[model samples]
Target: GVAEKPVEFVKLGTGVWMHTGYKVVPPWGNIRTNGLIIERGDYSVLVDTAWNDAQTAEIVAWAKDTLQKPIRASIHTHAHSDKMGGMDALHMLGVETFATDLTNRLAIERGLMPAKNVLNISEIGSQIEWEGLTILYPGGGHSEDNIVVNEGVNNILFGGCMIRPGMTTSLGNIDDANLGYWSKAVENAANAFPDSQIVIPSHGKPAGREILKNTAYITRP
Candidate 1:
């Protein structure tokens, strides 16, 4: 089945763009997933892949032909399909893919191809600098392998699936969630990137820190 909506890109800031793709979940209709493309000098770096390869490929084409900044590497914020569903596409396109070792192992078990490079940070509260962006393991919220990316220059945080959309009370899908620690994970991200004024969530429009606090509260134990 085709995605309910085509993958689209929207500018969030100079040198920063958000890519959103939709997937139909039967009676629920369309569900969206958001990712980031951070411009790096002559190239760009992707945050996560779309729901599938075709959508992700469209993103790649736009970045290269339209933005004129080809994606040289991508960092998966988790092991979920929305985060790395296009692993094969990225490999085929010669893009370097990266993720935490835990995410890689979980990706394999989850039936998704693992990334080429490991992010090196495993323990919770640990943060790593990659391509001028900060990737942090704020424990586990949406999923055990969930992580967040921060672009400090613009004070934008790519919450991935860690942060829920808008002010929704729902925690989205929690099949693989750390139920007890989900709120803590959200808090960890808030503390780690205190200056991130702009937050880009996986399933919603970009907003401010209020979204983070909202997620933390709703997912509280």
Candidate 2:
């Protein structure tokens, strides 16, 4: 069952925005995916691209008409289509897209389109800071190419799909998960952003540190 309403946006912090998109994923019916828009000065950065071109285009329009902060760069939290599916739309607007080298390669290897700007953070644990934001690899979790973004300025942690919301009863999808190391990877994220005042999961409402701690519990094998 598809949601009758259009996508929605929620402000989680100063200049930090989250938007949701819905689509049918078969047996699972309609599901939701979220994307983030982080505003820095006059320009903005996009965390994911929703789940389709239409959704991506809507967000792009909102960024320009509503936020008035055109997206300059976009980063994929993982290689999954739900995260980077709007690359085509973003590229049309001349937005530079990025993802870890592993994410890039694995995505291509799986016959999925990858970002043009490849970030070299393939090591088990690596990090890079760009435009004052930190992109960290806490090792393989949810997906081998999963990564988290730390917006230190606002003390916000975009956990992507690596962490679940506090009310989550189980891990949603683990088709590409590294269950053996998922727990520790999440722990690494918690330790890395100990002061994160807000934690956002890719598919749920924004929450606090409780989401991270609960994810550590629900994901354990």
Candidate 3:
């Protein structure tokens, strides 16, 4: 799938910022995906990097200044090129990278993404830890590496690009997509974390539980 460039930061709440990028495709609402910066104490956790190394750096820079903290965690909601594009630079910044176990297997198995080189999925081994962060997969969706991260007082979920804001969210990249079980994956997230008021999708703006509504809508057979 072709990815259009993303816009700069849009504030969502206190100590929180996001970049929105989208493809002008049907049922996509011109909103592609999102890279989030959740500020935690003196450091920030980056949830998914934008496509290509350049955008990734820009987004990180924004996070650093916006949150007034050194970024410590480089988390990939999924291992797609667009989300984990800047794994190399992120590592240089002393950022510990993380993702689901499946993200590593599939990205390497099919030679689908560049995370192996940039983030070194093998080194982290399914999970990563920093000062105060927890990155998990719970299960897979867009790909096997789909993850949900919890940061400070807020419980934020990164849906990757697998789930979105409509009854018909994008089926995701055809090469690594799992449209058949997309809804179930999202539902699990909702059920598991019912208190999450903020859901940071791998793409687009931070949304509420309405996303689950979109999940149900899309799953209706």
Predicted structure with the largest lDDT when compared to the true one: 1
**Every candidate's lDDT:** 0.92, 0.86, 0.62
Tens digit of per-residue lDDT, candidate 1, span 1-221: 54498888899998999999899997678899999999999999999999899989999999999889999999999999999998889889989999999999999999999999999998989998999999999997889989999999999999988888998987788989998898999999999899989998999999999999999999998
Determine the backbone clash count of candidate 1: 0
> What TM-score does candidate 2 get on C-alpha atoms?
0.95
* lDDT score at residue 183, model 2, on the 0-100 scale: 88
Off by over 4 Å in 1: 1-3
Candidate 3 whole-model C-alpha lDDT, 0 to 1: 0.62
Best by TM-score: 1
Q: Number of clashes in model 2?
A: 0
Say which prediction, candidate 1 or candidate 3, comes out ahead on lDDT: 1
Put down candidate 3 lDDT per residue, 1-221, tens digits, no spaces: 34564657776666666765444566454545677777777878777776656666766677677567867776677767667666777776667776545675565564444343233233221334443555544455566556666554565555657566544455546566565666666776677666767776565456777876685466434
lDDT of 2 at 114: 84
| Candidate order (lDDT) | 1, 2, 3
The TM-scores of all predictions, comma-separated, are 0.98, 0.95, 0.75
